[PDB]
Homo-oligomer: A and B are copies of this chain.
Amino acid sequence: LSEVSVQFSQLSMFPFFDMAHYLASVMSAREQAGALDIASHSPMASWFSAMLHCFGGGILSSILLAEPPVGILANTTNIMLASAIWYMVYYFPYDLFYNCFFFLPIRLIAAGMKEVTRTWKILSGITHAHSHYKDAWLVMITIGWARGAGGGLISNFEQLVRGVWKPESNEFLKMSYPVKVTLIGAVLFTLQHGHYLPISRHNLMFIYTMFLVSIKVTMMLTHS
């Protein structure tokens, strides 16, 4: 019944789906070591730390294609979409905002939909690197990877923002889950647009997002 896979490709990420990535990347960023003291005494700095968690995929991919990293900032509807979350995640009265989304079913859905945004971002840069470079197999793996887990690759430099400098914790030295997966994804869909992979996009686009959500949902059910 492939007729159900076609209805998935018709999902618009701008309203509902862009914020799940913004929230799961901001909730996670706060749960990091000492990130709470940062926001209480330096509001300016915890904010930019959140933006690298959300728009680092766009930020890093812009640095790689010689595109202005301020370009991600121009989308004021997208920037303002992420910063409103950052305020309530931290500065909500009685912290009712974080207490609600931390709830396990809610937190499960919030993180599950960030994995959805991860897929189009791979295909974003894969086709976007296609624009600058037609059939460059590498360049498409990179810019697809750079948008999938950008917040985890600038993480070493994102740590340096909140004040933490751990020069021993690189991403190539030990590949984390959200990154070693986007590497796998950026390679698969590069074989899709390159037609080296025997499955349609809309069927591959749908099967990759499912393995990615079934893990993080299993991850958070066995982490709590």
Contacts and interface: CB of A to CB of B under 8 A. Distances in A.
Interface of A: 38, 42, 44-45, 47-48, 62-71, 73-74, 76, 79, 129, 132-133, 136-139, 142-143, 156, 160-161, 163-165, 167-168, 170, 172-175
B65 A172 contact: no
Contacts of A66: 62, 66-69, 71
Contact of A167 (B76, B79, B160, B173): B160
Contacts of A156: 160
B172 A45 contact: yes
Contacts of A71: 66
Contact of A138 (B42, B45, B73): B73
Nearest to A172: B45
21 contacts: A42-B173, A42-B174, A44-B173, A47-B172, A63-B69, A66-B69, A66-B71, A68-B132, A70-B133, A70-B143, A73-B138, A76-B137, A76-B138, A156-B160, A160-B167, A161-B170, A161-B172, A163-B168, A163-B173, A164-B167, A165-B167
Contacts of A47: 172
A76 B174 CA distance: 26
B68 A64 contact: yes
A160 B170 CA distance: 9
A139 B74 CA distance: 6
A44 B143 contact: no
Nearest to A64: B70
A167 B138 CA distance: 32
A1 B174 CA distance: 58
